[model samples]
Target: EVLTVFHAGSLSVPFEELEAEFEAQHPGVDVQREAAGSAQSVRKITELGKKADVLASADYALIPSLMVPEYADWYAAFARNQMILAYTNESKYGDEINTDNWYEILRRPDVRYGFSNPNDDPAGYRSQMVTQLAESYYNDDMIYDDLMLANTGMTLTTEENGTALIHVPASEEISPNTSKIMLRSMEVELSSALETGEIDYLYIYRSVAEQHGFEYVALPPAIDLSSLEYADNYSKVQVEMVNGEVVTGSPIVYGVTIPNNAENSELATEFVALLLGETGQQIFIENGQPPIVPAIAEGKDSMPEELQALVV
Candidate 1:
């Protein structure tokens, strides 16, 4: 039987390699792969009614957010990543951009850039969170209002009672300032736009930049959302999506799980075992996507008994 796998776009290369190796070890089985925004991947089974043997997300919480109760029962947080500003040699101010001034450079009237769609992608929402946090980090409140809030139809409302909401206006009413905000499906796909010079700068994962050999400015730990040490500070920002859903900003984490309806459970279990096992740990390190071996599992009981042995 074949195992159909739905995973985050950023996991494309590594998962491809892992699948090839897994298939080699099990000759009678095959692996079918689909890539999408982490949130969109969950929506496939949750909202679109599609099913797969495995589901992996760039953000593990999505499993609990959109998949629990009906579509899935458990998830394993497997990896971590950070948001970055990626660019190529053709990017404007490429020579001048640095961590301290990258946001300022982006706010330049002549500079153009892109990010993934917030509605379908975690990177998109994280991009907005980073910009909002940047305002306080850089002592500039206009960063979010001018560069982000003004571009999208999504309005962020904060009440006098200390509550906030994100409202996605009608399609016609939700305007995107395309000149400055280049939104796509996922951050990984934006590499092509940067490579082709269609965009001067883009928001992407640090591992994506390193894997693709693009130049990237390392954001401070406070704003990068990569370090658990800064968890409290990172949790301060919340983004409201078009669907009236709210996502509290937090440190980046990755997740994976096998669907209850999977046809090739044995093989999928093997593949997932390898993914969370020592071999997978090394693959992640070599690929610039750091691994969290024996990572914390959310619903250990839902995981296969054999697979549970490999997860923390």
Candidate 2:
């Protein structure tokens, strides 16, 4: 028996442990996994017509917005993350960089920073939101413009309602100024660039930086996209991707689903059962990512009967 899982790159660490435990419990089963930027993983199923027993994403909203009422009927939001700036001792002004001055460091003409592609990764788009929203929090209007817009071909337009909309051109047209900005298809892909000094800073999740032991600047809750208390403020920034998909800023949450075309439905349910259970929660917590106590489920009625009791 085989269980295929398509998951976000950031979930790689915790999910690997889950895979190990699942396979141990079911001696004959094989768990095949593919990790990518959350949106790309969804496109593999929705756009490429590929099949997977389970699909997981870094952003919970993607499930309802892109997959529900089609590829998958139900989803469970199970984890939380915070956006941060990661760097090493070798980074310019590493000793001086902090929450308040992080943006200023990235704007330095001699410094290089990296982020994922907005057209491909949730972290990529969220990175854009955080930088844009920082303008309102820090009372500095040039954070996003000086660090982002000036470097990448991506543009921004402010609406009449005080909201800013970032338009991400097609991937090919992104045309990142490589001398100052290092952009990749996925956030995790930038880890090495920061480590090797190819880049000086990285916009990424708190868990990833902690997992790799990279020094990071924890942004204010007002702009980190981590607290529900700032949800409305976070909403002030939105990213419009190449496909015209508009993603509004929200508290970061991770979600999972078992697709309708899953070849191993029963086994998939068991694996997810292990995920929503205590075992899965422990794995995420150990990896520095918090698991939602009693995961939130959408399309609850359509979910596997065996997993109904584990989620809210």
Candidate 3:
């Protein structure tokens, strides 16, 4: 029986290794993997009426918001990653780019950049949140204007609550300014564009940059959504996508679950045991994403017995 798993695109590198390792241990059971934006992956099961034995997302919150009570009963937070500005030596002004001036560098006229479509990928909206949050941290309100608002059809709305809300139109309505921005459906799709100099920089996950060997810089943790210490600070901004999902800034946490529609739930549970156990921790750490150690599960009672004790 083939065990199908849908996962975040950033998990590609480590999961490729896990896939191979799982196959070696379980002969005659091939693990078929599908990669996409976490929301998009969930839609494949919920809206598109598809089925997969396992579903993993770059955002753990997505599981509760989109899958709980319906498509999936429980999910385990498995790994962590952060937003990064990835580039190469061939990238314009690569020598001068750093955490402090990275946003300013992206504003240069000749410098081009790319991010996944917010309507499709978490990295895309998270990138917008990072830029928007920088205004308060760096005292430059134009950081979001010059880099994002001026480049895409997206708009910024200040909620009555004082939280900045970025409104993303449908994918069909998003017309990226070709000269300044490139957009793809998945975060991993733009890695090659950075490599080929199609774009000078990419707003992506740090683990992906390390996996692909791109020179990258970590943004300030306060706005980068990478640290729990700034959880309150990060929540000051949110992105409301066309899909009716409002994503608030939070520490990046990846999640995994066996959908209620799974065909081989028993086999999927075994694979997840490897994912949350020592093997998964080592794999994520080696691939640049920090594993959750024992992992954290919500709705634990609904999860398989094999997965229950591994997560708190």
Candidate 4:
């Protein structure tokens, strides 16, 4: 027997540990894992018509956006995270950088920074959200124009509501000298780029920064989107990517669900149960991914009874 779990790229480390423990318990079962941006993971079923027993997202809302009413009926918000600037010792200005002036340093022409594609990765979208919020927090109007808007050949617009809209044109949209802006399908991939010195800095999750033992610049809670208390303020900014997908700024939330096309529903539920259980909670917490015990389930009634008991 096999358990196929499609998950966010950030879950790579923790899920690997979970797989080891799970397979130890169910020796007869094999775990086949696939990784993607949270949004792209759900789209595998919704857009690509792929099948998997479980789909985990860095943002829970994606299930509701791309899968609900057709592919999957229920979702569980299980964890939370925040964005950070990740880099290594080899990175330029690594020693002088701090939270206070991280953004300003990034704007330096000699400095290079990277982020994932907003259309594919939540971390990428959140990176843009963080920078937009920083413009107000730091009172620098040109942060986006200098660092983000200039790197790609995208149209820049300000909505009536004050949200900054960036239009992604195509893969060739990167500036002629892309040495400064490193983009990947997902943010986790940026880790390797940083390790190889292919990029000097990357906008990524705090957990990922900690996991790789890389230095990071922590943004303010008001803009980091790591706190539930800042929900009201976070919603003030929205990012409309090139694909016409609108991503509103919100607290970082990780979600999971069982797809309707799953080949092994029972095993999938079992895996999710353990994920929300005490052991799984500890695994996430130990790895810097704080667990939101008794996760809030969207489309509550559609949740399997076994899985429902693990969440609110």
Which candidate number would show the highest TM-score if scored against the true structure? Answer: 2
Worst 10 residues of 1 by lDDT: 162-171
lDDT of 4 by residue, 33-152 (tens): 998887788878888878899899987878888888788888888888878898899999989999899987888888888888777666777877888788888888898788877777
What's the lDDT for candidate 4?
Answer: 0.83
Q: What is the lDDT for 79 in model 3?
A: 85
Taking the tens digit of each residue's C-alpha lDDT, what string does model 2 give over 241-303?
A: 999999899998899999888888888999999999999999988886788878889888988
Query: Among these predicted structures, which one has the highest lDDT?
Result: 2
| Clash pairs detected, candidate 3 | none
Model 4 ranges off by over 4 Å: 1-4, 8-10, 27-53, 66-73, 107-110, 116-126, 149-155, 167-193, 196-199, 207-212, 225-235, 238-252, 259-267, 286-289, 299-309
- TM-score of candidate 4 to 2 decimals: 0.73
* Runs off by more than 4 Å, candidate 1: 1-10, 34-53, 65-73, 108-110, 116-122, 138-142, 149-193, 196-198, 207-212, 225-235, 241-247, 250-252, 260-264, 285-289, 301-309
What TM-score do all the candidates reach, one by one?
Answer: 0.73, 0.75, 0.74, 0.73
| Better model by lDDT: candidate 2 vs candidate 3 | 2
TM-score of the candidate numbered 1? 0.73
lDDT digits (tens) for residues 1-312 of candidate 1? 788899998798889888888888889887899999889998888888887888999878888888886777788888778888999999999999999999889889788888877777777778877877787688987887777777777677665654334454544555688787677775555788899888888888888788888898888878888765687877777776656677877888889988766677677788889899887888777766778767778789777898779876
Root-mean-square deviation of every model: 4.4, 4.1, 4.2, 4.2
Compute the lDDT of residue 196 as modeled in candidate 3.
Answer: 91
Report residue 108 deviation for candidate 1 (angstroms). Answer: 4.2
The TM-score ranking, best first, is 2, 3, 4, 1
Look at candidate 1 and tell me the lDDT of residue 271.
85
Q: lDDT for every model? A: 0.80, 0.90, 0.89, 0.83
User: Could you tell me which 10 consecutive residues in candidate 3 have the lowest summed lDDT?
Assistant: 221-230
